[PDB]
Amino acid sequence: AADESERGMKVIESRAQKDEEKMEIQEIQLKEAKHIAEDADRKYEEVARKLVIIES
């Protein structure tokens, strides 16, 4: 019973590492994607306000 439970432990620990790495790479790609979404959505409100003032 012990040897079968050690083997299963090893396999689920390896899957848990393999997925924990995937989360961290997405979680980081996203602080990036959200930050470029926000740097983009500021530049505009300055350019669109700049548009409405130079149209006026």
């Binding site: 602080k31 930050h35 926000e38 740097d39 959505d41 500021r42 300055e46």
Partner: protein, 372 residues
Amino acid sequence: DEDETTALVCDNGSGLVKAGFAGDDAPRAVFPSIVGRPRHQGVMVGMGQKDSYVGDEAQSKRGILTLKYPIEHGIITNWDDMEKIWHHTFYNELRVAPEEHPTLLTEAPLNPKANREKMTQIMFETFNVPAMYVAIQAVLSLYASGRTTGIVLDSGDGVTHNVPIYEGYALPHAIMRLDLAGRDLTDYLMKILTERGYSFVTTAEREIVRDIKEKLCYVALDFENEMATAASSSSLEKSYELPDGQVITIGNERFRCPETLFQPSFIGMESAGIHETTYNSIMKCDIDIRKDLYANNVMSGGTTMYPGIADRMQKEITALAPSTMKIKIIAPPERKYSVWIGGSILASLSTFQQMWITKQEYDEAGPSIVHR
């Protein structure tokens, strides 16, 4: 409606006042926190002799007046001149009569007990407001971001603060104050820009260095290999056109200015910087609450608006915090008004009615009543 419409929210700052009605999404009134006193006798065409000037008329006419700032580093230092800014806010800016409006005011982090009692004395006894309430600024900022536990890095015009808050109670012994903010930051840009070979000679040159700081300044992550980048000279440069043609270029200094917030040494300050201070606040708090504070670094204040401030802070504290920890730097877009918006929400709220200090409480308990 009696007071649903009727609650006022006045956030008193070192540089700006933000004011308006609880309910609104943003301040109806924003203006400098100055009180100008004319250096000479005379008049403007069509007006009478004016003893005093406040807000923008004091800024615009600054050449003939002696300008004074009532709030030094977030604390009210001159009460004669503050009652003047309040008067202006109610009567001219919001054009309301104060004696029928409940007023939510804000104070600073370790605001002396005696001050909270004094502005209550002036609110009730010289403005005769029905009821009032003083909220702590970081606490309204947090709450406006939905939560109740977190640590706010709050940074405006004269002060920076770290106020760790747990289930609403700001933690007195863990609060840190760093007297370097947006005011200090405009004057440093000034020098690195004259030092770029320039001259902000007339007052129309002075004022706009501040508009350069706001529009073009950045907080780079890896400020190290950003200077290095500056040198290879990429299309990192940025030219601004002055009141006239005089196109001034700012490439590099653009980020050397907010690197002052992480390195106070850029300005002859020996104090620690924003990120270390976030952290130190945190290793001054209870142990069990430190995972909470780390996942809830809420930013508020005009000077925390520099793009990429959050990414630099993100990486600044990850790399100081134990790896078992989750770091999370919340920086909302409306952050230059977080404080105010948190007050608008709270004061328009359904449950806040029972915390308003009324003239009944006051006339019966003395200023002590609201002081808590």
